[PDB]
Structures are given as C-alpha cells and as structure tokens.
C-alpha cells in the first residue's frame, strides 16, 4: 500500500505553501523514505 499512501500524502502536502529553496537553483536530493528502495525529491516547505 505504500505507494498509494505516498501519492496521497504528497497531494495533501503540496497544497500547503511552497518551498523557498526551489528558487535557489540548487537541486534537492533523493531522500530515502523506507526500505526496499523508495525515494523522494522535495525541498522543505517553508513559505505557508
């Protein structure tokens, strides 16, 4: 079920403000969010 959760969570998270680092020109890293090899690429959401 993990995937069907991740998507939904992201859908809920991106409506809440933006990430200021996205204008810095510095790409974000692919942080692992579990075992088995799942990864996420997103800057911290700062400006609400």
């Amino acid at each position: 079920r993990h995937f069907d959760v991740a998507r939904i969570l992201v859908d809920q998270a991106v409506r809440l403000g933006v990430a200021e680092a996205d204008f810095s020109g510095l790409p974000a890293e692919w942080l692992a969010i579990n075992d088995y090899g799942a990864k996420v690429q997103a800057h911290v959401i700062d400006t609400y």
């Binding site: 996205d22 204008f23 020109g25 790409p27 692919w30 690429q41």
Partner: protein, 49 residues
C-alpha cells in the same frame, strides 16, 4: 551494448519554471498534475531542446 540514457531535463526561467530539473528515469517517467499544471510545457522543453 550499454545504451546511452537521458539522465536529466532542466528548465530555466520558463512560465511556471524559474529553475527546475527533472531526473529522467531509466524506464518510465510520469508527470502528473491537474489541467494547466504545465506537463505539455515540459514535453515542449524536451522537444525544443
């Protein structure tokens, strides 16, 4: 052997994209978003490049 691969796609100062890099997958990359999200714009980026 060892087919070359497109690793990344960068958009700079475009409508909705000041500076955005997508890491192209080795097999499948899937853009997803509501109407007007700007996916056709990304494929436009790829082709025009």
């Amino acid at each position: 052997i060892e087919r070359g691969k497109f690793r990344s796609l960068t958009l700079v100062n475009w409508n909705g994209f000041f500076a955005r890099t997508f890491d192209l997958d080795e097999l499948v990359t899937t853009l997803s978003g509501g109407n007007g999200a700007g996916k056709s714009t990304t494929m436009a980026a790829f082709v025009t490049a």
